[PDB]
RNA sequence: CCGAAACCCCCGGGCUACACGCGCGCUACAAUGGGCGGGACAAUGGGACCCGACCUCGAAAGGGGAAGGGAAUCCCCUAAACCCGCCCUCAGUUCGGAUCGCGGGCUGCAACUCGCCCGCGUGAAGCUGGAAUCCCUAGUACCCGCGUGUCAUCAUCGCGCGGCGAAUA
RNA sequence: AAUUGGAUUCAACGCCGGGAACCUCACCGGGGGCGACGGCAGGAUGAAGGCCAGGCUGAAGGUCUUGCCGGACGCGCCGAGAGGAGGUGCAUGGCCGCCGUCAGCUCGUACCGUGAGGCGUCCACUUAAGUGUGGUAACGAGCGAGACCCGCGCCCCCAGUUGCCAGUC
């Protein structure tokens, strides 16, 4: 066997949790021991911008959020038990990284 | 364009080449013979007379 | 007469004149470098399709 | 680079292809682009009121659209798919592009407004607005505001619920800006 | 409307010229102070020709070597205001830092015009400001540093963070 | 020499400039240079492109003198293009400032008035609000504003390679 890390991030809240939940449900029952889906930070990205193209009078200034959230999953299964679980549909728009070590 | 450029001389049943053939690269490339300074023809190289 | 090519050939190693956008084609006007080189004015028009959120 | 930048790279990728295809596929009747991104061949799903223009006049346009996609991106085997929009009259961006053609054509203002209003209210629009900022064929900067039913509310759960389609309908004396804001039942 | 041009290419110069006027701001007129040392404390963020541990040389600016890091896991990073002891003992000064000589680094083809820093020398006005006038009502103002954008380099700017923490209504 | 331009009372003056040493750049001085597609006359009897070397250029076969290659099509005008950060924002689309984060604007049916219109949406009380309350020849509805969305205090569940001589053989 081979301890795999699924490191899964997404740009929006609804898309990331459904995959994290589904990954912990399908893997649960087979030849997998699975450590729980741990939430790491939101590296919230602030873009802080000038609205007005005149830059004139008072110019009201847009605050921007890009929030990118990262769930992490350790798993003890084969490379074949890994693809079976990576079958799932996945939101657009959800990055799934795989490191493989023994 | 620029006419006339008939600078190859004529024998009676043969031809001969007026200009010089380069000694840096092989034959096939003629020299703008200045008398002391050789330009190149294919590309454009500063060559001196050997 | 005859002359060799030109499409500009001077130094533009770095600065603002080095940059151009991928929407309004400018040097001095804004170039947001996060891998989204556009002016500030485009940025505002484009963002809701990007997925940025107005809310503070 | 990292997690953060790549997502923005992708979204920037959406815009460069959605900007060009709108402007071309005004003959078809542009309404969207469902873009499925893979390492095999970028799969773009072009949304049209009508698929018979997008294909082309004998395969030309679908191949033309396959060929400019290779230039912008580094996926050189991009597929083309045409999905219909299921209600183009519920889509505002279709109605904006559709209204723009009609004003390009020269048909009168309130007439070209009435029909439009009437075709989408028949379709199922809780409420609808058309605004037409422009010269209005003189030389004063006045907009004309065609109004029925409910409208966009307050805040932002305003703008998400409604539809909004914008189109510059070109003329040869000036310009007229075509705004069409639809409110679907919800 | 222009059509070897109100195009196009190039180097150099100009936008950084000044007897002056104003606007918006920074820094400031010291003992609630300065040096020196020691100790106790954050947060947003940004980081691949990019942040740079740590080790070494250099007075330093920086240079040489080199770990980790595409990130809650590594780096910028030290917060600053604070307080305690010591030296100093209210003068245009040990204030204040303009102006000028020199030595020296750093980026780029290149910083004289026109960059910033470091060291020594230089050491200007200013010792609380008329008429007039602006901003704001609480974790705010007042105050102290901190980051980021754009970005080599010009930041006494713009956006944004936490630390101390009220008056009057 | 040029100190590019625009902006001008609130609402032009840290403004377009979220980055002027060249670049940027639109200004000035000097050297050098492309004009599509058609018509017209020209063509390979060798380049439209390249190039030593002087003579000239701040540099560039760039230009002349001068001599020449690789393989093959382009001036001059005439309509008429590409280019122009070249003019008109009192011709505009977009977006934005300010009045104004203000508290208004409408429609149905009824009712009144010869009619433009009125009434309702007025009055009393009350709120930041045409907000709500009572009254009333009105009764209701939409937009605006409001809730709605995001952020902040306190707790709990799910989850822990961040977190610690917490509790510990």
UniProtKB/Swiss-Prot annotation, chain A:
GO molecular function, one term: structural constituent of ribosome
GO cellular component assignments: small ribosomal subunit
Keywords, comma-separated and alphabetical: Ribonucleoprotein, Ribosomal protein
GO biological process, one term: translation
UniProt cross-references to InterPro entries, sorted A to Z: Ribosomal_uS10, Ribosomal_uS10_CS, Ribosomal_uS10_dom, Ribosomal_uS10_dom_sf, Ribosomal_uS10_euk/arc
PANTHER family according to UniProt: 30S RIBOSOMAL PROTEIN S10 FAMILY MEMBER
Role description: Involved in the binding of tRNA to the ribosomes.
HAMAP family linked: Ribosomal_uS10
NCBIfam families from the UniProt entry: uS10_euk_arch (TIGR01046)
Quaternary structure and partners: Part of the 30S ribosomal subunit.
Family under the similarity heading: Belongs to the universal ribosomal protein uS10 family.
Name of the protein this chain belongs to: Small ribosomal subunit protein uS10
Upper taxonomic lineage: Archaea, Methanobacteriati, Methanobacteriota, Thermococci, Thermococcales
Gene that this sequence comes from: rps10
From Swiss-Prot, chain B:
InterPro entries assigned: Ribosomal_eS31 (IPR002906), Ribosomal_eS31_arc (IPR022845), Ribosomal_zn-bd (IPR011332)
Pfam families assigned to the protein according to its UniProt record, in alphabetical order: Ribosomal_S27 (PF01599)
Superkingdom: Archaea
Listed GO CC annotations: ribonucleoprotein complex; ribosome
Cofactor or coenzyme needed: Zn(2+)
Binding site for Zn(2+): 22, 25, 40, 43
Keyword Transmembrane part of the UniProt annotation: no
Cofactor note: Binds 1 zinc ion per subunit.
GO terms of molecular function: structural constituent of ribosome; zinc ion binding
Keywords associated with the record: Metal-binding, Ribonucleoprotein, Ribosomal protein, Zinc, Zinc-finger
Coiled-coil boundaries: none
Family: Belongs to the eukaryotic ribosomal protein eS31 family.
Subunit structure: Part of the 30S ribosomal subunit.
This protein's name: Small ribosomal subunit protein eS31
UniProt gene name: rps27ae
Curated annotation (Swiss-Prot), chain C:
Function description: Binds 16S rRNA, required for the assembly of 30S particles.
Family stated for the protein in its record: Belongs to the universal ribosomal protein uS14 family. Zinc-binding uS14 subfamily.
PROSITE patterns: RIBOSOMAL_S14
Superkingdom of origin organism: Archaea
HAMAP family assigned to the protein according to its UniProt record, in alphabetical order: Ribosomal_uS14_2_A
A molecular function (GO) term: structural constituent of ribosome
A single cellular component GO annotation: cytosolic small ribosomal subunit
Organism classification: Archaea, Methanobacteriati, Methanobacteriota, Thermococci, Thermococcales
UniProt cross-references to Pfam families, sorted A to Z: Ribosomal_S14 (PF00253)
Entry's cofactor comment: Binds 1 zinc ion per subunit.
Keyword Transmembrane: no
BP GO annotations: cytoplasmic translation
Keywords for the protein's UniProt record, in alphabetical order: Metal-binding, Ribonucleoprotein, Ribosomal protein, RNA-binding, rRNA-binding, Zinc
Primary gene name: rps14
Residues bound to Zn(2+): 21, 24, 39, 42
Protein name as catalogued: Small ribosomal subunit protein uS14
Stretches of the chain forming a coiled coil according to its record: none
Quaternary state and interactors: Part of the 30S ribosomal subunit.
Keyword tRNA processing: no
Cofactor(s) required for function per UniProt: Zn(2+)
Swiss-Prot record, chain D:
One GO CC term on file: cytosolic small ribosomal subunit
SUPFAM superfamilies xrefs: Prokaryotic type KH domain (KH-domain type II), Ribosomal protein S3 C-terminal domain
Entry-linked Pfam families: KH_2, Ribosomal_S3_C
One Gene Ontology term of the molecular function aspect: rRNA binding
Annotated ranges, domain KH type-2: 17-86
Biological process per Gene Ontology, one example term: translation
InterPro entries registered for this protein in UniProt: KH_dom, KH_dom-like_a/b, KH_dom_type_2, KH_sf_prok-type, Ribosomal_S3_C_sf, Ribosomal_uS3_arc, Ribosomal_uS3_C, Ribosomal_uS3_euk/arc
PROSITE patterns, per database record: KH_TYPE_2 (PS50823)
The keyword Chloroplast is assigned to this record: no
Key words, A-Z: Ribonucleoprotein, Ribosomal protein, RNA-binding, rRNA-binding
Source species, domain of life: Archaea
Quaternary structure note: Part of the 30S ribosomal subunit.
Biological role: Binds the lower part of the 30S subunit head.
Protein family per UniProt: Belongs to the universal ribosomal protein uS3 family.
Protein's recorded name: Small ribosomal subunit protein uS3
Encoding gene, per UniProt annotation: rps3
């Amino acid at each position: 066997m081979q301890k795999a890390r699924i490191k899964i991030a997404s740009t929006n809240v609804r898309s990331l949790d459904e995959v994290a939940n589904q990954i912990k449900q399908i893997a649960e029952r087979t030849g997998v021991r699975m450590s729980g889906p741990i939430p790491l930070p939101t590296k919230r990205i602030r873009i802080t911008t000038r609205k007005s193209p005149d830059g004139e009078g008072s110019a009201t200034f847009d605050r921007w959020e890009l929030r990118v959230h990262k769930r992490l999953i350790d798993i003890e299964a084969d490379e074949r038990a890994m693809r079976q679980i990576m079958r799932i549909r996945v939101p657009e728009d959800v990055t799934i990284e795989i490191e493989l070590i023994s | 364009m620029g006419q006339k450029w008939k600078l190859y001389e004529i024998k009676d049943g043969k031809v001969i080449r007026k200009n010089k053939f380069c000694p840096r690269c092989g034959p096939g490339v003629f020299m703008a013979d200045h008398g002391d300074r050789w330009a190149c023809g294919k590309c454009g190289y500063t060559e001196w007379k050997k | 007469m005859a002359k060799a090519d030109y499409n500009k050939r001077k130094p533009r190693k770095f600065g603002k004149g080095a940059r151009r956008c991928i929407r309004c084609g400018q040097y001095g006007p804004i170039i947001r470098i996060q891998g989204l080189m556009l002016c500030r004015h485009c940025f505002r028009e484009v963002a809701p399709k990007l997925g940025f959120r107005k809310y503070e | 680079m990292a997690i953060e930048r790549y997502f923005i790279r992708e979204a920037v990728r959406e815009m460069l292809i959605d900007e060009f295809l709108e402007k071309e596929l005004r003959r078809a009747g542009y309404g969207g682009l469902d873009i499925k991104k893979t390492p095999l061949g970028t799969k773009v799903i072009i949304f049209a009121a009508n698929p018979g223009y997008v294909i082309g006049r004998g395969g030309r346009r679908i191949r033309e659209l396959t060929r400019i996609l290779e230039k912008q991106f580094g996926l050189e085997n991009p597929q083309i798919e045409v999905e219909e929009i299921k209600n183009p009259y519920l889509n505002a961006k279709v109605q904006a592009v559709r209204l723009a053609q009609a004003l390009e054509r020269g048909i009168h203002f309130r007439r070209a407004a009435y029909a439009a209003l009437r075709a989408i209210m028949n379709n199922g629009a809780r409420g609808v607005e058309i605004r037409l900022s422009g010269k209005l064929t003189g030389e004063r900067a006045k907009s004309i505001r065609f109004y029925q039913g409910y409208l966009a509310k307050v805040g932002n759960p305003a703008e998400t619920l409604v539809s909004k389609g914008y189109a510059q309908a070109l003329l040869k004396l000036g310009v007229i800006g075509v705004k069409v804001a639809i409110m679907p039942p919800g």
